[PDB]
Design a protein around this ligand. Structure first.
Ligand SMILES: Nc1nonc1N1CCCCC1
Ligand SMILES: [Cl-]
Ligand SMILES: [Cl-]
Ligand SMILES: [Cl-]
Ligand SMILES: [Cl-]
Ligand SMILES: [Mg+2]
Length: 348
């Protein structure tokens, strides 16, 4: 057990191992209560997150367990991973706080890139890395649900990591109005058309790729309905095949109230873009999710010929998420979380 020291940060007392020095509050709070630090064992600048009393309810206790399980599993160059997890408690009986440590992320895609279009070579490399990480995520049967520029960390060498695992689900209010947290969502999850699956994340990648090519948001809707109208103008109104798959009777009735429209010519929307990029966008931005390209298929598309290497695009170890359908009491979720803290093994 390391020696811990105490200091007042973010309105509470933080107690951390001596290896972490120069703690300073960082960020806006979007990912929790976070400080930047220098890790003297590894030489890295790190982010340290404190979960203060996270066993206050069944919902919070299970969410804490979920975040630790997901972060402990993710081991891929293009996905956030866990450097350390610790508690100052010496036993289960005094266990109350959890701290998580990762690499410190400087910039994201949209603080760096807002209002600006990038060169085609840059677009190839950035989208390639998103798809490489997504192939890994999907091979573990995890659905991200919230890919957007603010969740993509990027360094000076254009290297990228996917963020946002195990946090609270987004609220109705967070999704209302002229807001970036809805502009990247697939129509079937935005409007609860049907039981969705991992294909929702490929729609989001298409929206991100379009924005890197043009410098502009693809579907900047002022509300859910305005956004649906922007989507259907580009990709066309649904045919009878997809209408049958919309299990919501009320949503199906609303769709039929709209005049029918054909799919637009993407070469006349994305004027001047690499024809191979136009082709890939047509395969991602398909209304019927069953027919969208997968991450593994997209890595083999000719647009990525200068980066694709099928011997260096790994998949994940199996991820048991049977806990997600299990009902337990607060103290049982707490004991499961403690076991995962004490069993952590750091990376090489
Ligand atoms: N759970 C997370 N998803 O994205 N980022 C996350 N956290 C950031 C701060 C350090 C802990 C991990
Ligand atoms: Cl230490
Ligand atoms: Cl504690
Ligand atoms: Cl964003
Ligand atoms: Cl597992
Ligand atoms: Mg999110």
């Amino acid at each position: 057990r390391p020696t811990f020291y105490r200091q007042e940060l973010n309105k509470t007392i933080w107690e951390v191992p001596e290896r972490y020095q120069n703690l300073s509050p960082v960020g806006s709070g979007a990912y929790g209560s976070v400080c930047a630090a220098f890790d003297t064992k590894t030489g890295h600048r790190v982010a340290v997150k404190k979960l203060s009393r996270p066993f206050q309810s069944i919902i919070h206790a299970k969410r804490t367990y979920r975040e630790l399980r997901l972060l402990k599993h993710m081991k891929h160059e293009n996905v956030i991973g866990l450097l350390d997890v610790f508690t100052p408690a010496r036993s289960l009986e005094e266990f109350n706080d959890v701290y998580l440590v990762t690499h410190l992320m400087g910039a994201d895609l949209n603080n760096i890139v807002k209002c600006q279009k990038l060169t085609d070579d840059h677009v190839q490399f950035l989208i390639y890395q998103i798809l490489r990480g997504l192939k890994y995520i999907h091979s573990a049967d995890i659905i991200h649900r919230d890919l957007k520029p603010s969740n993509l960390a990027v360094n000076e060498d254009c290297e990228l990591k996917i963020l946002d695992f195990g946090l609270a689900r987004h609220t109705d209010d967070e999704m209302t109005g002229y807001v970036a947290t809805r502009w990247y969502r697939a129509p079937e999850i935005m409007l609860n058309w049907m039981h969705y699956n991992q294909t929702v994340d490929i729609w989001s990648v298409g929206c991100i790729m379009a924005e890197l090519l043009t410098g502009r948001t693809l579907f900047p809707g002022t509300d859910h309905i305005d956004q649906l109208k922007l989507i259907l103008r580009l990709v066309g109104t649904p045919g009878a095949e997809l209408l049958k798959k919309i299990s919501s009777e009320s949503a199906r009735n609303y769709i039929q109230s709209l005049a029918q429209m054909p799919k637009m010519n993407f070469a006349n929307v994305f004027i001047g873009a690499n024809p191979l990029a136009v082709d890939l966008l047509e395969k991602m931005l398909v209304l019927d999710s069953d027919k969208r390209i997968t991450a593994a298929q997209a890595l083999a598309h000719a647009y990525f010929a200068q980066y694709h290497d099928p011997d260096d695009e790994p998949v994940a170890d199996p991820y048991d998420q049977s806990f997600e359908s299990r009902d337990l009491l607060i103290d049982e979720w707490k004991s499961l979380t403690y076991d995962e803290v004490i069993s952590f093994v750091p990376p090489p």
